[PDB]
Amino acid sequence: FTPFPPRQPTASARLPLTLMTLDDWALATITGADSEKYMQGQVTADVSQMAEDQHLLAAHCDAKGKMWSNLRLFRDGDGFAWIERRSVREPQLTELKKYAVFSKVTIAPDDERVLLGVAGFQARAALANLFSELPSKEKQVVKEGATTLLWFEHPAERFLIVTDEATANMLTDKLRGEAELNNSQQWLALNIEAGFPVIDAANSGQFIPQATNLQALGGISFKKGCYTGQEMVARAKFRGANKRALWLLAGSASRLPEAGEDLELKMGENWRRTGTVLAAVKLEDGQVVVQVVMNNDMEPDSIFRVRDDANTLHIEPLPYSLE
Ligand SMILES: [Ca+2]
Ligand SMILES: [Cl-]
């Protein structure tokens, strides 16, 4: 079917109708009688209380609570599928499979299905012509034949499509010259804007889930039964235990910081390396936008920069509360 070529991404507010190939994300599945039990023991979400029409962003942690990756989970066949960054799928699956020697599950990558995104102006009306039913806030996953559609509210309405090559080709042919075409960087920009954490390889194993605000995004149950890393995830909820959070910065820079890179914070006439970048994109309207993990008590008027840059970044209020 083939990835779409990149064009410079746009902020959600000004984003035209856009169809994207999500090549930098990747799919995996679990099937078998023990699918729910097995996943319940390895992720932060309560998968026993996930309906067929729901999807959520969970964490898969090691025994110390550090996330191999977050993952967007939904029911698929008699088990689950999930989407995470391609750069971490291989090690994530190795670590997930460590406990499955005798369990009634089969865990595998899925590179047969195609991941697409639809976003921007009138995305819903454009798609309503191409599928009988679309997902919505009231029914967040819809399935039609080979296709699974996931609804997102943030930062503006958009849809993630999990489908076969034939349907991907149909959609592309039907929307060509109406939807702009872009690649993963546009979906990435939207996740940065929404404050939804992205974990690439450099950041695998580095963060407890709450350092990336996952508790505020519905990704952690504190009442479910035991799972790998649970004790440490629970400890991070104590008053004052976790000192990090995920932030949204915007401004200008001469280069994008890489995942795992630090930024610099201004203080007096000095600059101090601070934080860990998760993702960054340069937008059409000129700004660099950056998702970063740093201390949860940064002053709102803090001034940042990409290391040694002539220009600066500032905090854009996160669109959801951490209270
Ligand atoms: Ca444009
Ligand atoms: Cl952490």
Last residue within a domain, chosen from 163, 194, 225: 194
As beta bridge partners, residue 43 has: 60
Token digits for 149?
Answer: 């559609």
| Closest ligand, as measured to the CA of 14 | 1
Neighbours of 67 (CB within 10 A): 28
Residue 247 assigned ligand-binding role: no
* Beta-sheet pairing, 180-182 with 18-21: parallel
Ligand 1: distance of its center to the CA of 47 in Å? 40
Nearest Cα to Cα of residue 60 among 26, 83, 76: 83
**Both 230 and 297 in a single domain?**
yes
Token digits for 47?
Answer: 């998968």
Neighbours of 272 (CB within 10 A): 11
Residue 187 assigned ligand-binding role: yes
Ligand 1: distance of its center to the CA of 159 in Å? 20
**Both 107 and 119 in a single domain?**
no
Ligand 2: distance of its center to the CA of 108 in Å? 28
Domain with 179, as residue range(s), is 11-24+112-194
**Both 258 and 298 in a single domain?**
yes
Q: How far is CA 209 from the centre of its chain?
A: 13
Ligand 2: distance of its center to the CA of 240 in Å? 13
Cα–Cα dist 263/288, whole Å: 13
Task: Using the Cα atoms of residue 278, residue 220, residue 154 and residue 302 in order, give the sign of their dihedral.
Answer: negative
| Closest ligand, as measured to the CA of 16 | 1
Ligand 2: distance of its center to the CA of 114 in Å? 32
Ligand 1: distance of its center to the CA of 180 in Å? 9
**Both 309 and 222 in a single domain?**
yes
**Both 203 and 227 in a single domain?**
yes
Domain count of the chain?
3
What was the structure determination method?
X-ray
The residue with tokens 């546009």 is: 186
Last residue within a domain, chosen from 66, 83, 111: 111
Cα–Cα dist 309/288, whole Å: 12
Q: What's the chain's length in residues?
A: 323
* Beta-sheet pairing, 276-282 with 270-274: unpaired
User: Which residues, 6 or more positions from 268, have their beta carbon under 8 angstroms from its beta carbon?
Assistant: none
Here the CATH number for the domain that contains residue 42 is 3.30.70.1400
| Closest ligand, as measured to the CA of 67 | 2
The residue with tokens 């697409």 is: 116
Ligand 1: distance of its center to the CA of 285 in Å? 9
Cα–Cα dist 110/211, whole Å: 29
Deposited resolution, Å: 1.3
Ligand 2: distance of its center to the CA of 245 in Å? 9
**Both 308 and 215 in a single domain?**
yes
CA triple 218-13-16, angle to 5 deg: 110
**Both 18 and 157 in a single domain?**
yes
| Closest ligand, as measured to the CA of 8 | 1
| Closest ligand, as measured to the CA of 293 | 2
What are the distances in angstroms from CA 216 to CA 32, 57, 111, 323? 31, 11, 31, 8
Domain membership of residue 136 (yes or no) is yes
**Both 235 and 185 in a single domain?**
no
**Both 281 and 252 in a single domain?**
yes
**Both 300 and 207 in a single domain?**
yes
H helices of 195-286, where?
230-235
Ligand 2: distance of its center to the CA of 150 in Å? 29
Ligand 1: distance of its center to the CA of 157 in Å? 19
Neighbours of 24 (CB within 10 A): 17
Domain membership of residue 90 (yes or no) is yes
Nearest Cα to Cα of residue 43 among 287, 215, 227: 227
| Closest ligand, as measured to the CA of 18 | 1
Here the CATH number for the domain that contains residue 160 is 3.30.70.1630
